[PDB]
Amino acid sequence: DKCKEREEKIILVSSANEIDVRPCPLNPNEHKGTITWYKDDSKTPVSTEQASRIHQHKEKLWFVPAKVEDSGHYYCVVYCLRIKISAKFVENEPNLCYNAQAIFKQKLPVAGDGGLVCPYMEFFKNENNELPKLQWYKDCKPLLLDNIHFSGVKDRLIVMNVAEKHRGNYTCHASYTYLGKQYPITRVIEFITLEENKPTRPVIVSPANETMEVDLGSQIQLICNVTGQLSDIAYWKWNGSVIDEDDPVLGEDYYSVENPANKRRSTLITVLNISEIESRFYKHPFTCFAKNTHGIDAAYIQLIYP
């Protein structure tokens, strides 16, 4: 009936001389049965004997510990599925406690409390379901987890009051027991900080609470010009309602331009198209709103008869 074949696109780079585990990567959906593992192009399954350096246990593939020479492809055969998996094992760079190829990039905005996370710790839990305690380093120098500047909880490091100087390469170290023997585990994370997501209000440049004489039955467009961030929103209302999108006579077009000079003083232009001036439009103002998480500005144009 023919085995299906998939080739996995994530290549996970791990440390030589560290324990590692790989699960066969099905989506829930493509589960269901006996999972055998094979090395390279063998059609003879891996060792099931946990004493052996590379072996199958609980349908996972274990390197105890891994070696650079293990780098290569492996198959897990889960009707049939057979997935080619490629893995890479790398020595630390000289005089370093990690290898840049194993870096997981992570990022937090400045000025908050935020977390780094030591990845792929899932499978190192001890019954009753706890992770071994992690030690954390930045550029290969120990961090004090004093719950004032840093905290270590489970797989996370809480960096308190994230600032620019926190940038650097962080390692998380654990020691895991497997068959009564202890094995080291590290992951490395390149920590990048982003500019302060900083609380300001949009400025409505135009309209500016003014009247405008217009002829009944004719057509006009009104421009709402807002100085702000690209992320702010600028939109029109009339008589307490957003401009309905199936409205047969009112329509909005939204345009924007990034200010290279100052990302915080970009422009939004929302054009309201009044395809026919109806007599009702003379009773209430058209109000442009400019909105983001910290506040609202509003300014209007009131149509009047000439």
Binding site: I10, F104, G115, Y120
Partner: protein, 152 residues
Amino acid sequence: APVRSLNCRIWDVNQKTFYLRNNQLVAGYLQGPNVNLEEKFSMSFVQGEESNDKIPVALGLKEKNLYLSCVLKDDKPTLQLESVDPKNYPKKKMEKRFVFNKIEINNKLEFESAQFPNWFLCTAMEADQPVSLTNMPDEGVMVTKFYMQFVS
């Protein structure tokens, strides 16, 4: 455009990023050349609740015409990707399945299903599992907070 639409990157507060496996959105950790697998989003400002707390948005996969959407599956609110016709999408009045109420507190974002109030966009504690929805964001079962960075 008839809808204000912004390119961004979105990652959860466990530093997981999104990618496609089969045809599903999953969340995990990528290294080296694999960062290529990361999906960016087009975030549109659609119509819905008029509030100082929430902004209704739809979330599309940048350039793939795949939209995040909340649908009942076996009597349970489920996040599914939906192929849309580029000819009609994105638009201001997105159907309610595509609508999320974006809530931002302290540089972190939650996305509440418009269709399913009290249900939030979330990822699992473990890497490489599908993105999902949950109505228990206050227990640390699932991750329901996200950061975003606008890339246009």
